[PDB]
Amino acid sequence: APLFPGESIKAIVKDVMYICPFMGAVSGTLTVTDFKLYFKNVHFILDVPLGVISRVEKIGIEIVCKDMRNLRLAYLGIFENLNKHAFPLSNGQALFAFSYKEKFPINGWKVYDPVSEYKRQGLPNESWKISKINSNYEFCDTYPAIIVVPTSVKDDDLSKVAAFRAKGRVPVLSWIHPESQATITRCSQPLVGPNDKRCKEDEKYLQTIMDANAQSHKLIIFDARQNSVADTNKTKGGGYESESAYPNAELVFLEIHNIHVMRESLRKLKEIVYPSIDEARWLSNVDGTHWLEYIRMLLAGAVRIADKIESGKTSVVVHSSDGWDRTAQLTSLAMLMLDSYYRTIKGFETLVEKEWISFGHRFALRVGHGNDNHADADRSPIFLQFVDCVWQMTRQFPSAFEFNELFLITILDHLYSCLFGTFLCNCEQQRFKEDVYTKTISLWSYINSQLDEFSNPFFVNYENHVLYPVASLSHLELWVNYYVRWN
C-alpha cells in the first residue's frame, strides 16, 4: 500500500472480503496504517482515512463512517487494529497530523495573520483599536489572543462586560464596512437570568459600539436562536438584551434550531442516501429530514445581517448562546456576502481560520477527532452545514467564487481525516498548548500548492458587489456530489 511521509503500516491481512452494497463482494488485501485503511484487488481501490471512522462493530465487521457511508468487511487482528488506530486519543496515542512529514512549497500557517486581516479592513482607526488584553487567554480563554474593540473602553470595564457574557465572550469586531463604518461584532448571550440582572458596563459597551458608527442612531442585535429557546436560556441564567436595559438597541430572533436537531437531520439523510436511494419515495424522505429547510433558515438569517449592514448602514451584534456554533455560521455567511475578498481562495481560508478556528468553534468536540464515543451528543455537523450553505452560494453565483466545488469537498474530507493541524482542538489556546503550530501541517499548504485543482475556471474577480442569495427551497438543491458521493 502507498504511504505518506511519516505513515506506518500496522497490519496487512490478505484475502479479506469487502461487501459492496450492490455488486456483491470483492476479495483483496487489507492494509491498516496509522493514517488510513487501504484495500486493493488485482483494479479496485478503497482508500479510507481512519479519521472518518465513527464506530466499528462486529456483525463480520461493520465500519460506520462520518462521510455518508458504511463499510462491510468479511474476514490481533482486524477489529482490534481498526479500533486502536481509528480512535488513538481513546488509546493513548496521538492524531496522525502530528506524524505527517510532507513538506509543501507553500506554508498554509501564514495564510491568516490577524493584524494583516484587520489592516486589510482599515483597522485600527480612530474608533477601533487592536487589544492585547487576551494575549495570554486570561481574559477569555476560548477567544483568539488578539481582539478588536472600541478605542474608548477601559480594560477594567471590558472585564466587567466579560463577567456579564457567557464564557466571557464579549462583543468583538468581526467586520467593518469600509465606507459607512457599520460593523458586525459577535458575542455570546448576556447573563440576565430570570430576575433581569443588568450590567451598566455591558449596556455602556454596546452603546460605544453604536457610537463608533457616528451617523447611526440605533444598534441591531440579531439573536440567532428561536425566541422560545432564548427564554429557556433566560430561566437558566442566560437570556438576551431587553428593550429597557438597552435603549438605543433593537433585538430580533433568527429562529435557528439547536445543534441536536442538525445532527438528527443529517442522520436521517444518511439513512436514505446510503447504500441506495429509493427513488419511489425520494421526494418525501428528503423532505422528512428537513435538511434543506435548516440550510434556508441560515441563508435567510445571513442575508438579514448582510442587508442591515449594506442597505441599512447599521452596526449589528450577532450572538447565540455560547456564541460559537450559530454565531460563527451567521457572521461568516454574512461576511462572505458582504466582502468579495472572502470569495477568493486565500480569502475564504482566512475566513475559516478567523471566524471559525480562531474564535473557538469546538471542532475536536463537534467532530470527535480520534475519540471513540460515537453517541456523544456534543457532535453536530455545524461546520458541514455551513459549507453546504457556501456551496449553495457558488451554485446561485457560479462565477462569483474563485474556489470550486472540489475545494469545499476537500475541506470536508480533511475535517474528518486529521491529516492536518488546521481543524484540530476546540480553541486557540488548546492549539498552542498541544504544539499544533509546530508539529502539524496546514491544510492550506496542500491546497495552495496545487491551486489549479481547486479553482473555478468561471471565476470573475470584478463580481465584487454584495451578493444576496435567494433563501427559498425553490432556489436551493441537495448537495448530491457530497451527500450521495459514494454511489
Short mmCIF file of C-alpha atoms in Angstrom, two decimals:
data_model
loop_
_atom_site.label_atom_id
_atom_site.label_comp_id
_atom_site.label_asym_id
_atom_site.label_seq_id
_atom_site.Cartn_x
_atom_site.Cartn_y
_atom_site.Cartn_z
CA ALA A 1 0.00 0.00 0.00
CA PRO A 2 1.13 3.60 -0.78
CA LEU A 3 2.29 5.70 2.18
CA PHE A 4 2.61 9.34 3.19
CA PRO A 5 5.88 10.62 4.64
CA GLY A 6 5.53 9.65 8.30
CA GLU A 7 2.90 6.97 7.73
CA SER A 8 3.47 3.44 9.09
CA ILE A 9 1.79 0.09 8.31
CA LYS A 10 0.18 -1.57 11.31
CA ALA A 11 -1.31 -4.66 9.66
CA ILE A 12 -1.64 -6.34 6.28
CA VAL A 13 -4.25 -9.08 6.01
CA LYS A 14 -4.74 -10.96 2.73
CA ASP A 15 -7.96 -12.44 1.31
CA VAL A 16 -10.45 -10.13 3.03
CA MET A 17 -13.91 -9.63 1.58
CA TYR A 18 -15.26 -6.12 1.06
CA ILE A 19 -19.02 -6.22 0.65
CA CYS A 20 -20.36 -3.77 -1.93
CA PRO A 21 -23.97 -2.88 -1.25
CA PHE A 22 -24.92 -3.98 -4.76
CA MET A 23 -22.02 -5.50 -6.67
CA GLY A 24 -21.60 -8.47 -4.33
CA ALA A 25 -18.28 -8.97 -2.56
CA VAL A 26 -14.71 -8.42 -3.68
CA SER A 27 -11.60 -10.21 -2.49
CA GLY A 28 -8.46 -8.28 -1.66
CA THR A 29 -5.67 -7.41 0.72
CA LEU A 30 -6.42 -5.11 3.67
CA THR A 31 -3.65 -2.83 4.92
CA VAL A 32 -4.15 -0.82 8.11
CA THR A 33 -1.82 2.15 8.75
CA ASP A 34 -1.89 4.72 11.48
CA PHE A 35 -3.45 7.09 8.90
CA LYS A 36 -5.84 5.03 6.75
CA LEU A 37 -7.23 1.68 5.84
CA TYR A 38 -6.40 0.52 2.32
CA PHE A 39 -7.89 -2.30 0.28
CA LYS A 40 -6.64 -3.47 -3.10
CA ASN A 41 -7.67 -6.15 -5.60
CA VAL A 42 -5.51 -7.23 -8.53
CA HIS A 43 -8.04 -2.55 -10.39
CA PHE A 44 -10.21 -2.00 -7.31
CA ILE A 45 -9.09 0.59 -4.75
CA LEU A 46 -10.75 1.56 -1.48
CA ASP A 47 -8.83 4.30 0.40
CA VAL A 48 -10.37 5.40 3.70
CA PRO A 49 -8.79 7.67 6.32
CA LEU A 50 -9.31 6.26 9.82
CA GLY A 51 -10.42 9.77 10.84
CA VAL A 52 -13.77 9.35 9.05
CA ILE A 53 -14.49 6.22 11.08
CA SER A 54 -17.17 6.74 13.75
CA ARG A 55 -17.55 3.27 15.19
CA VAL A 56 -16.51 -0.31 14.48
CA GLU A 57 -18.84 -3.16 15.33
CA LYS A 58 -18.84 -6.93 14.80
CA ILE A 59 -21.90 -8.28 12.98
CA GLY A 60 -18.37 -9.79 10.05
CA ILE A 61 -17.21 -6.21 10.67
CA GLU A 62 -19.26 -3.04 10.14
CA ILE A 63 -17.41 0.27 9.79
CA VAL A 64 -19.67 3.27 10.31
CA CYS A 65 -18.16 6.35 8.67
CA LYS A 66 -18.80 10.09 9.11
CA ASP A 67 -18.87 10.93 5.39
CA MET A 68 -22.21 9.39 4.34
CA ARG A 69 -21.19 5.76 4.00
CA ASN A 70 -20.64 2.47 5.76
CA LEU A 71 -18.24 -0.36 5.01
CA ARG A 72 -18.75 -4.09 5.41
CA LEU A 73 -15.82 -6.46 5.84
CA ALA A 74 -15.73 -10.25 5.78
CA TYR A 75 -12.61 -11.72 7.38
CA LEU A 76 -4.75 -9.04 16.87
CA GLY A 77 -6.13 -8.56 14.26
CA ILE A 78 -8.66 -6.58 12.21
CA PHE A 79 -11.18 -5.45 14.82
CA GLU A 80 -8.63 -4.58 17.47
CA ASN A 81 -6.38 -2.78 14.97
CA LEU A 82 -9.08 -0.65 13.36
CA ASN A 83 -10.30 0.22 16.84
CA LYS A 84 -6.85 1.04 18.18
CA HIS A 85 -5.86 3.26 15.28
CA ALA A 86 -9.27 4.74 14.35
CA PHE A 87 -9.52 6.11 17.87
CA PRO A 88 -5.97 6.95 19.03
CA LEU A 89 -6.99 9.54 21.64
CA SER A 90 -9.08 6.84 23.30
CA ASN A 91 -5.98 4.61 23.26
CA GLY A 92 -3.14 6.83 24.49
CA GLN A 93 -1.82 7.64 21.01
CA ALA A 94 -1.71 10.91 19.03
CA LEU A 95 -3.71 12.03 15.99
CA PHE A 96 -1.91 11.34 12.70
CA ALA A 97 -1.47 15.03 11.92
CA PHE A 98 1.40 15.01 14.42
CA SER A 99 3.29 12.34 12.40
CA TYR A 100 2.69 13.80 8.93
CA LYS A 101 6.08 14.74 7.45
CA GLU A 102 5.28 16.07 4.00
CA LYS A 103 6.82 19.43 3.04
CA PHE A 104 4.95 21.80 0.75
CA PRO A 105 6.34 24.74 -1.23
CA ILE A 106 3.80 26.99 0.49
CA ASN A 107 3.23 27.23 4.25
CA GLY A 108 -0.50 27.42 4.98
CA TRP A 109 0.09 28.66 8.55
CA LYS A 110 0.95 32.10 7.06
CA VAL A 111 -2.33 32.50 5.15
CA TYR A 112 -4.14 34.11 8.08
CA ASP A 113 -2.47 36.85 10.04
CA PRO A 114 -4.89 38.67 12.37
CA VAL A 115 -3.12 42.04 12.28
CA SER A 116 -2.90 41.90 8.46
CA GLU A 117 -6.56 40.99 8.14
CA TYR A 118 -7.65 43.80 10.43
CA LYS A 119 -5.38 46.11 8.44
CA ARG A 120 -6.94 44.90 5.19
CA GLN A 121 -10.25 46.18 6.69
CA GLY A 122 -8.89 49.62 7.64
CA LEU A 123 -8.09 48.82 11.29
CA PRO A 124 -7.16 50.12 13.75
CA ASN A 125 -8.69 53.53 13.15
CA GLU A 126 -9.99 56.33 15.35
CA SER A 127 -12.82 54.24 16.82
CA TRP A 128 -11.48 50.68 16.89
CA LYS A 129 -8.20 49.50 18.38
CA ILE A 130 -6.29 46.21 18.44
CA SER A 131 -6.49 44.94 22.02
CA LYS A 132 -3.87 42.68 23.62
CA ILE A 133 -5.96 42.16 26.74
CA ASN A 134 -6.25 38.43 25.82
CA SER A 135 -2.66 37.85 24.73
CA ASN A 136 -2.42 35.12 27.36
CA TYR A 137 -6.00 33.89 27.06
CA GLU A 138 -6.69 35.05 30.63
CA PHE A 139 -9.47 37.44 29.60
CA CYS A 140 -11.48 34.91 27.54
CA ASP A 141 -9.83 31.57 27.14
CA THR A 142 -11.88 30.47 24.10
CA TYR A 143 -11.15 33.73 22.20
CA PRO A 144 -8.15 34.34 19.99
CA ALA A 145 -5.08 36.13 21.52
CA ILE A 146 -5.91 39.34 19.62
CA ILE A 147 -9.27 41.16 19.58
CA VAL A 148 -10.59 44.41 18.17
CA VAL A 149 -12.67 46.63 20.42
CA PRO A 150 -13.77 50.29 20.61
CA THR A 151 -10.90 52.67 21.38
CA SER A 152 -12.74 54.17 24.36
CA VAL A 153 -13.26 51.08 26.51
CA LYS A 154 -11.02 50.67 29.54
CA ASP A 155 -9.61 47.22 30.26
CA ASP A 156 -11.29 47.19 33.69
CA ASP A 157 -14.67 47.84 32.06
CA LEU A 158 -14.11 45.09 29.46
CA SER A 159 -13.51 42.65 32.31
CA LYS A 160 -16.90 43.54 33.81
CA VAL A 161 -18.52 43.00 30.41
CA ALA A 162 -16.81 39.58 30.26
CA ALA A 163 -18.35 38.65 33.63
CA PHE A 164 -21.76 39.51 32.09
CA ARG A 165 -21.33 37.32 28.98
CA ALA A 166 -21.31 33.51 28.90
CA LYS A 167 -17.74 32.17 28.85
CA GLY A 168 -16.52 35.75 28.86
CA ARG A 169 -17.14 36.04 25.10
CA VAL A 170 -17.67 39.80 24.91
CA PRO A 171 -18.72 41.62 21.74
CA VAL A 172 -15.68 41.90 19.45
CA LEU A 173 -15.37 43.20 15.88
CA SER A 174 -15.74 40.65 13.06
CA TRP A 175 -16.09 43.01 10.08
CA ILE A 176 -16.31 46.73 9.35
CA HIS A 177 -17.76 48.43 6.29
CA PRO A 178 -15.06 50.48 4.52
CA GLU A 179 -17.49 53.34 3.76
CA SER A 180 -20.23 53.54 6.40
CA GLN A 181 -18.20 52.12 9.29
CA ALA A 182 -21.15 49.86 10.09
CA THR A 183 -19.79 46.78 11.87
CA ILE A 184 -20.53 43.17 12.66
CA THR A 185 -19.47 42.43 16.19
CA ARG A 186 -20.07 38.95 17.70
CA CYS A 187 -20.55 37.57 21.23
CA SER A 188 -22.34 35.05 23.45
CA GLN A 189 -25.62 35.59 25.33
CA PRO A 190 -25.86 38.13 28.20
CA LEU A 191 -26.26 36.70 31.72
CA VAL A 192 -29.59 38.31 32.54
CA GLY A 193 -31.37 35.42 34.17
CA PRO A 194 -34.97 35.17 35.46
CA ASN A 195 -34.56 38.30 37.64
CA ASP A 196 -33.39 40.56 34.82
CA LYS A 197 -29.92 41.42 36.08
CA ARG A 198 -28.29 44.46 34.47
CA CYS A 199 -24.67 45.36 33.84
CA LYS A 200 -24.05 49.06 33.35
CA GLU A 201 -20.72 48.31 31.65
CA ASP A 202 -22.35 45.90 29.14
CA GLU A 203 -25.05 48.45 28.31
CA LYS A 204 -22.45 51.19 28.06
CA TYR A 205 -20.19 48.98 25.95
CA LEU A 206 -22.91 48.21 23.41
CA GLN A 207 -23.54 51.94 23.28
CA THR A 208 -19.90 52.71 22.42
CA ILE A 209 -20.07 50.14 19.62
CA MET A 210 -23.01 52.11 18.24
CA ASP A 211 -21.24 55.49 18.67
CA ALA A 212 -18.31 54.17 16.64
CA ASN A 213 -20.76 54.31 13.69
CA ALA A 214 -21.29 58.06 14.12
CA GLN A 215 -24.08 58.53 11.53
CA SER A 216 -26.23 55.74 13.01
CA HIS A 217 -28.86 56.31 15.67
CA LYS A 218 -29.54 52.69 16.56
CA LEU A 219 -27.90 49.27 17.00
CA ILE A 220 -29.36 45.96 15.84
CA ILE A 221 -28.89 42.68 17.72
CA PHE A 222 -29.54 39.50 15.84
CA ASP A 223 -30.05 36.68 18.28
CA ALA A 224 -29.56 33.50 16.28
CA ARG A 225 -31.94 31.49 18.41
CA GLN A 226 -35.63 30.88 18.46
CA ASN A 227 -37.49 33.18 20.86
CA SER A 228 -38.57 30.18 22.95
CA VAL A 229 -35.06 28.81 23.27
CA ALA A 230 -33.72 32.20 24.32
CA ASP A 231 -36.42 32.25 27.01
CA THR A 232 -35.39 28.86 28.33
CA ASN A 233 -31.81 30.05 28.38
CA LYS A 234 -33.03 33.08 30.36
CA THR A 235 -34.53 30.86 33.08
CA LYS A 236 -31.16 29.13 33.26
CA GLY A 237 -29.32 32.40 33.88
CA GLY A 238 -28.71 33.37 30.27
CA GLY A 239 -31.03 35.34 28.03
CA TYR A 240 -30.92 38.37 25.77
CA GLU A 241 -30.81 42.14 25.66
CA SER A 242 -34.02 43.89 26.77
CA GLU A 243 -35.73 46.94 25.38
CA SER A 244 -35.45 48.74 28.70
CA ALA A 245 -31.80 47.91 29.54
CA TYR A 246 -30.52 48.59 26.03
CA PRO A 247 -32.44 51.72 24.96
CA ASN A 248 -30.73 52.51 21.64
CA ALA A 249 -30.66 48.85 20.54
CA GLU A 250 -33.29 46.65 18.89
CA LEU A 251 -33.22 42.83 19.04
CA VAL A 252 -34.54 40.29 16.55
CA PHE A 253 -34.58 36.46 16.61
CA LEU A 254 -33.39 34.38 13.64
CA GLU A 255 -35.07 31.16 14.88
CA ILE A 256 -32.19 28.81 14.10
CA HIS A 257 -32.60 25.47 15.90
CA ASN A 258 -30.08 23.88 18.27
CA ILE A 259 -27.08 21.65 17.41
CA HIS A 260 -29.01 18.44 18.21
CA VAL A 261 -31.66 18.86 15.52
CA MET A 262 -28.88 19.34 12.93
CA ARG A 263 -27.21 16.07 14.00
CA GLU A 264 -30.56 14.28 13.82
CA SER A 265 -31.27 15.83 10.41
CA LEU A 266 -28.02 14.58 8.87
CA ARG A 267 -28.59 11.18 10.44
CA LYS A 268 -31.96 10.81 8.71
CA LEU A 269 -30.39 11.99 5.47
CA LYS A 270 -27.67 9.30 5.64
CA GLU A 271 -30.34 6.61 6.07
CA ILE A 272 -31.93 7.47 2.73
CA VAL A 273 -28.82 8.13 0.61
CA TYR A 274 -26.83 5.05 1.58
CA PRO A 275 -26.49 2.32 0.41
CA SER A 276 -29.06 3.42 -2.14
CA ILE A 277 -31.82 5.87 -2.86
CA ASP A 278 -35.37 4.53 -3.01
CA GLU A 279 -36.37 6.92 -5.79
CA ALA A 280 -40.05 5.97 -5.49
CA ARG A 281 -40.16 7.77 -2.16
CA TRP A 282 -37.25 10.19 -2.54
CA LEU A 283 -39.38 13.35 -2.52
CA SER A 284 -40.93 12.80 0.92
CA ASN A 285 -37.90 11.17 2.60
CA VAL A 286 -35.59 14.12 1.89
CA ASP A 287 -38.37 16.50 2.90
CA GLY A 288 -38.76 14.46 6.05
CA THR A 289 -35.16 15.19 7.06
CA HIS A 290 -35.75 18.95 6.87
CA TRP A 291 -32.10 19.27 5.85
CA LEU A 292 -32.74 21.96 3.21
CA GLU A 293 -35.10 23.97 5.42
CA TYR A 294 -32.35 24.35 8.01
CA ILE A 295 -29.99 25.46 5.18
CA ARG A 296 -32.61 28.03 4.09
CA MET A 297 -33.09 29.38 7.63
CA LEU A 298 -29.32 30.05 7.88
CA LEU A 299 -29.02 31.72 4.46
CA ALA A 300 -32.13 33.84 5.26
CA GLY A 301 -30.54 34.75 8.58
CA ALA A 302 -27.26 35.78 6.97
CA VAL A 303 -28.99 37.86 4.27
CA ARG A 304 -30.78 39.81 7.01
CA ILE A 305 -27.50 40.56 8.67
CA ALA A 306 -25.90 41.45 5.29
CA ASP A 307 -28.83 43.66 4.24
CA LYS A 308 -28.77 45.56 7.53
CA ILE A 309 -25.08 46.35 7.17
CA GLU A 310 -25.08 47.17 3.48
CA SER A 311 -28.50 48.79 2.91
CA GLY A 312 -29.37 49.81 6.46
CA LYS A 313 -25.84 51.12 7.14
CA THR A 314 -26.36 49.94 10.71
CA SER A 315 -23.91 48.19 13.04
CA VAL A 316 -25.13 44.81 14.25
CA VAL A 317 -24.28 42.37 17.05
CA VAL A 318 -24.67 38.62 16.44
CA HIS A 319 -25.00 36.25 19.33
CA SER A 320 -26.36 32.81 20.10
CA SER A 321 -25.95 31.01 23.49
CA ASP A 322 -22.22 30.38 23.74
CA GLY A 323 -21.65 32.37 20.52
CA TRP A 324 -19.57 29.77 18.67
CA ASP A 325 -21.89 27.44 16.59
CA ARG A 326 -24.70 29.51 15.06
CA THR A 327 -22.90 32.79 15.62
CA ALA A 328 -19.94 31.61 13.52
CA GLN A 329 -22.24 30.32 10.75
CA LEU A 330 -24.05 33.64 10.55
CA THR A 331 -21.18 36.17 10.74
CA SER A 332 -19.11 34.29 8.21
CA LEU A 333 -22.01 33.74 5.76
CA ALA A 334 -22.85 37.48 6.01
CA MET A 335 -19.16 38.50 5.66
CA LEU A 336 -18.95 36.28 2.59
CA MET A 337 -21.94 38.11 1.15
CA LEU A 338 -20.51 41.49 2.02
CA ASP A 339 -16.78 41.26 1.25
CA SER A 340 -15.55 39.77 -2.04
CA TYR A 341 -12.08 39.20 -0.60
CA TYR A 342 -13.57 36.19 1.22
CA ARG A 343 -14.85 34.68 -2.05
CA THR A 344 -11.27 34.20 -3.24
CA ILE A 345 -9.42 31.05 -2.15
CA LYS A 346 -6.98 32.76 0.23
CA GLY A 347 -9.79 34.96 1.49
CA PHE A 348 -12.08 32.03 2.21
CA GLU A 349 -9.17 30.43 4.01
CA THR A 350 -8.74 33.46 6.22
CA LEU A 351 -12.50 33.49 6.78
CA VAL A 352 -12.46 29.88 8.07
CA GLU A 353 -9.21 30.49 10.09
CA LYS A 354 -10.60 33.62 11.69
CA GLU A 355 -14.36 33.38 12.26
CA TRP A 356 -14.36 29.58 12.80
CA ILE A 357 -10.99 28.36 14.03
CA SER A 358 -9.55 31.45 15.79
CA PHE A 359 -12.85 32.15 17.56
CA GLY A 360 -13.49 28.70 19.01
CA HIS A 361 -15.94 26.50 17.14
CA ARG A 362 -15.33 23.34 19.12
CA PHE A 363 -14.06 21.26 16.19
CA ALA A 364 -12.48 18.45 18.24
CA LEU A 365 -15.65 18.08 20.30
CA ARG A 366 -18.14 18.67 17.44
CA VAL A 367 -16.41 16.22 15.09
CA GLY A 368 -14.92 13.80 17.62
CA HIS A 369 -11.28 13.63 16.43
CA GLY A 370 -9.68 10.32 17.35
CA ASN A 371 -12.23 9.68 20.08
CA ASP A 372 -14.43 6.53 20.17
CA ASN A 373 -17.51 7.99 21.87
CA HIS A 374 -19.76 7.77 18.80
CA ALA A 375 -23.02 8.53 20.62
CA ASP A 376 -21.70 11.76 22.11
CA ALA A 377 -24.43 14.43 21.99
CA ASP A 378 -21.88 17.22 21.54
CA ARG A 379 -21.16 16.11 17.98
CA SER A 380 -23.00 18.07 15.29
CA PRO A 381 -22.28 18.89 11.61
CA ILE A 382 -22.43 22.65 12.24
CA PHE A 383 -19.36 23.30 10.09
CA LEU A 384 -20.53 20.87 7.43
CA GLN A 385 -23.92 22.60 7.30
CA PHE A 386 -22.07 25.86 6.89
CA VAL A 387 -20.01 24.53 3.96
CA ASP A 388 -23.24 23.31 2.36
CA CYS A 389 -24.60 26.89 2.57
CA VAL A 390 -21.40 28.17 0.94
CA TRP A 391 -21.86 25.61 -1.83
CA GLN A 392 -25.39 26.99 -2.27
CA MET A 393 -23.90 30.41 -2.96
CA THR A 394 -21.38 29.05 -5.51
CA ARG A 395 -24.33 27.49 -7.30
CA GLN A 396 -26.57 30.58 -7.38
CA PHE A 397 -23.45 32.55 -8.25
CA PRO A 398 -21.37 30.17 -10.48
CA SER A 399 -18.81 32.83 -11.39
CA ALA A 400 -18.59 34.59 -8.03
CA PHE A 401 -16.18 32.28 -6.18
CA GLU A 402 -12.54 31.61 -7.04
CA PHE A 403 -12.60 28.24 -5.41
CA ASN A 404 -14.54 25.38 -6.88
CA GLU A 405 -16.66 22.54 -5.52
CA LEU A 406 -13.72 20.17 -5.10
CA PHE A 407 -12.19 22.84 -2.78
CA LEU A 408 -15.23 22.60 -0.45
CA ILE A 409 -15.46 18.81 -0.51
CA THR A 410 -11.68 18.56 0.08
CA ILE A 411 -12.11 20.74 3.16
CA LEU A 412 -14.90 18.45 4.41
CA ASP A 413 -12.74 15.36 3.83
CA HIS A 414 -9.91 16.72 5.85
CA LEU A 415 -12.30 17.89 8.52
CA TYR A 416 -12.51 14.23 9.46
CA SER A 417 -9.11 12.87 8.36
CA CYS A 418 -6.83 14.76 10.80
CA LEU A 419 -4.06 14.74 8.24
CA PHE A 420 -3.57 18.43 9.00
CA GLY A 421 -3.36 20.68 12.05
CA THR A 422 -5.99 23.07 10.74
CA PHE A 423 -9.20 21.79 12.35
CA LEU A 424 -7.57 20.38 15.48
CA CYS A 425 -8.73 21.07 19.04
CA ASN A 426 -11.53 23.20 20.44
CA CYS A 427 -9.93 26.64 20.79
CA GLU A 428 -6.84 28.65 20.03
CA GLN A 429 -5.34 28.24 23.46
CA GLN A 430 -5.54 24.47 23.25
CA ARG A 431 -3.71 24.66 19.91
CA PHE A 432 -0.68 26.49 21.34
CA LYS A 433 -0.56 24.09 24.31
CA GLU A 434 -0.65 20.99 22.10
CA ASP A 435 2.07 22.32 19.79
CA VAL A 436 -0.20 22.27 16.74
CA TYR A 437 1.59 25.14 15.01
CA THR A 438 4.98 23.37 15.21
CA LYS A 439 4.19 19.64 14.99
CA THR A 440 1.48 19.64 12.28
CA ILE A 441 0.86 20.77 8.71
CA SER A 442 -1.77 23.25 7.46
CA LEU A 443 -4.50 22.12 5.04
CA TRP A 444 -3.85 25.27 3.03
CA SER A 445 -0.22 24.23 2.39
CA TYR A 446 -1.58 21.35 0.36
CA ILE A 447 -4.47 23.20 -1.30
CA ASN A 448 -2.41 26.27 -2.20
CA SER A 449 0.49 24.20 -3.56
CA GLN A 450 -1.96 22.86 -6.12
CA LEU A 451 -4.24 25.83 -6.84
CA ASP A 452 -5.37 24.83 -10.36
CA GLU A 453 -7.05 21.72 -8.99
CA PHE A 454 -9.21 23.90 -6.73
CA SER A 455 -10.00 26.91 -8.90
CA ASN A 456 -13.28 27.94 -10.50
CA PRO A 457 -12.46 28.45 -14.22
CA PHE A 458 -15.55 30.67 -14.48
CA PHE A 459 -14.39 32.94 -11.67
CA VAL A 460 -14.67 36.64 -12.38
CA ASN A 461 -12.92 38.86 -9.84
CA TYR A 462 -14.94 42.01 -10.51
CA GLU A 463 -18.12 40.21 -9.33
CA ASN A 464 -17.27 42.07 -6.15
CA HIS A 465 -20.62 43.59 -5.10
CA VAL A 466 -22.74 42.35 -2.20
CA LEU A 467 -24.32 39.01 -3.03
CA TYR A 468 -27.76 38.29 -1.68
CA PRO A 469 -28.53 34.63 -2.31
CA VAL A 470 -32.16 33.58 -2.51
CA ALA A 471 -33.26 31.73 0.60
CA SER A 472 -36.13 29.69 -0.79
CA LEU A 473 -36.39 25.90 -1.23
CA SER A 474 -37.10 26.57 -4.91
CA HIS A 475 -33.62 28.11 -5.20
CA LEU A 476 -31.74 25.50 -3.17
CA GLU A 477 -30.63 21.98 -4.00
CA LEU A 478 -29.44 18.86 -2.25
CA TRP A 479 -25.63 18.77 -2.49
CA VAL A 480 -25.66 15.35 -4.16
CA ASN A 481 -21.98 15.46 -5.11
CA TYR A 482 -21.19 15.39 -1.41
CA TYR A 483 -24.15 13.60 0.22
CA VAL A 484 -24.60 10.92 -2.46
CA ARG A 485 -20.94 10.77 -3.43
CA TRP A 486 -20.43 7.10 -2.62
CA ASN A 487 -22.98 5.61 -5.05
#
